[PDB]
């Protein structure tokens, strides 16, 4: 049996150009829960990121989050690429400021 | 507390 | 109110390089108290709650045995169901355990949980009742047979009704002003312009405790909606936001209502 | 990816597409054919043994405006008693297992059954 992960790429506070904020990648309903996840800065990935503690739901689908601090800019591309033995690429979804 | 599991 | 208490148990058998991985998570209500992990440096049971450290360390190292006897009965747990569905060892499998009371605002037992999991599927599970075990396919029958002999059925329910309990009311005074405060959500409507002549309303909720929340598009009164599962914000709070495509000029008609324990009465939004 | 099977006096539609409760609800009216409300425990009992392992959406449902647990034909029925004994949250939708029947939140997406009482022979 395996589950394919379902990301969201969000910010702490609403997000304002300058201003110190934490980005959090949040990937959901996956199995098995040998996961890869990388958080990215354009392209290349963010030196000091933080993991949680990974838990499961009552439909025992695994939940992890990724948080790192980030200045957000107008230019700046900020995207979080996961890598799941569900998936055969792994599968990179961009930050949306209105998401 | 949690509790002591019993062998499946 | 309703508090409840949840421990998740994993383990994720390693071929070859292991030695299987052995998690430990516990949560009071939404947030995260207790954690275990066999990779670690030194395996203890570790406070994820900053009011958990009151907690002697007569409860640490009793909370570690209790973790350790689990590891080594989880890892006997693998190789008895890789016979049961008579499996190669060269193959990797987990098994997840969650277990839990949940209490009113009284706050008394309402209904106790335990059920068992193999490769992300059902696998045993303990009946409403907390006497009776629900098998999924037929190898989960030869480990009811084995349950209801020992009596496996009549102990956890000793735990859930009584112990668990016992013990959740005892984390809620450690952590009450963590536990038991309730922030409202800050909630704002936000305006999206398209291409087809239409628009897409978003009604926000950010910063809230619980997590528990139902938010809700209106016209006159739903399937249309583009809801999104609760986030953790990082901090301790939630966010959730609902999507509507709406035609240009109708912003105003399209009203969103805001459902949270922590709110006196139901919000009503409109863009602005 | 969809199938059809038959029980006693009620024939069931199995949609093998992850989809949300409403979306569930959505696609078995399409087909003319009510989102699967459970009679009786030997019904839930063969429902659990016969299906693939993963979650299903049934319809039971919680209703803010009546605030109360209901069912898609708003009707009673002989497991009423096992799902209150449950003591589920007052929010989110029920979703069928192979071993359990719980509450979670409707937009999460899980497979979908549909099913409607044969009133008389095919």
Known sequence: ?99 | VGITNVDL | ?272 | ?122
Not at chain 3, 87 to 100: A, L, P
Request: charged share 25%; proline share 6%.
């Open chain 1, 1 to 99: 049996i395996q589950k394919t992960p379902q990301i969201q790429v969000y910010s702490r506070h609403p997000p304002e150009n300058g201003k110190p904020n934490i980005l959090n990648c949040y990937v959901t309903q996956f199995h098995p829960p040998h996961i890869e996840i990388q958080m990215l800065k354009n392209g290349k990935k963010i030196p000091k990121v933080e993991m949680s503690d990974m838990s499961f739901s009552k439909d025992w689908s695994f939940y992890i989050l990724a948080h790192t601090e980030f200045t957000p800019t107008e230019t700046d591309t900020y995207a979080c690429r996961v890598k799941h033995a569900s998936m055969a690429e792994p599968k990179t979804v961009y930050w949306d400021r209105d998401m």
């Open chain 3, 1 to 272: 109110g309703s508090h409840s208490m949840r421990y998740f148990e994993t383990s994720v058998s390693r071929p070859g390089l292991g030695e299987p991985r052995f998690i430990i998570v516990g949560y009071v209500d939404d947030t995260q108290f207790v954690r275990f992990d066999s990779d670690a440096e030194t395996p203890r049971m570790e406070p994820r709650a900053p009011w958990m450290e009151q907690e002697g360390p007569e409860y640490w190292e009793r909370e570690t045995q209790r973790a350790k006897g689990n590891e080594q009965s989880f890892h006997v747990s693998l190789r008895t169901l890789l016979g049961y569905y008579n499996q190669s060892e060269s193959g990797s499998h987990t098994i997840q355990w969650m277990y839990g009371c949940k209490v009113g605002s009284d706050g008394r037992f309402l209904r106790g949980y335990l059920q068992y999991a193999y490769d992300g599927r059902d696998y045993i599970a303990l009946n409403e009742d907390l006497k009776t075990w629900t098998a999924a396919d037929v190898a989960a029958i030869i480990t009811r047979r084995k349950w209801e002999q020992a009596g496996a059925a009549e102990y956890y329910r000793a735990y859930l009704e009584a112990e668990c309990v016992e013990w959740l009311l005892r984390y809620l005074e450690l952590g009450k002003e963590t536990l038991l405060r309730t922030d409202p959500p800050k909630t704002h409507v936000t305006h999206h312009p398209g291409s087809e002549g239409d628009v897409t309303l978003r009604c926000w909720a950010l910063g809230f405790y619980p997590a528990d929340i139902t938010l809700t598009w209106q016209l006159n009164g739903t399937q249309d909606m583009e809801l999104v599962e609760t986030r953790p914000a990082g901090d301790g709070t939630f966010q959730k936001w609902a999507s509507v495509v709406v035609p240009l000029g109708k912003e105003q008609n399209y009203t969103c209502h805001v459902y949270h324990e922590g709110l006196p009465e139901p919000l009503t939004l409109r863009w602005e």
């Open chain 4, 1 to 122: 990816v969809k199938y059809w099977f038959c029980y006693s006096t009620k024939c069931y539609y199995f949609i093998m597409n992850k989809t949300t409760w409403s979306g569930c609800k959505a696609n078995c009216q399409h087909y003319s054919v009510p989102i699967l409300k459970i009679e009786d425990e030997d019904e839930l009992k063969f429902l659990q043994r016969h299906v693939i392992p993963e979650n299903y959406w049934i319809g039971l449902s919680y209703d803010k405006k009546k605030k109360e647990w209901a069912w898609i034909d708003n009707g009673p029925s002989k497991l009423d008693m096992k799902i209150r004994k449950m003591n589920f949250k007052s929010r989110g939708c029920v979703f069928l297992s192979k071993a359990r029947i719980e509450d979670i939140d409707c937009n999460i997406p899980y497979y979908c059954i549909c099913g409607k009482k044969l009133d008389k022979f095919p």
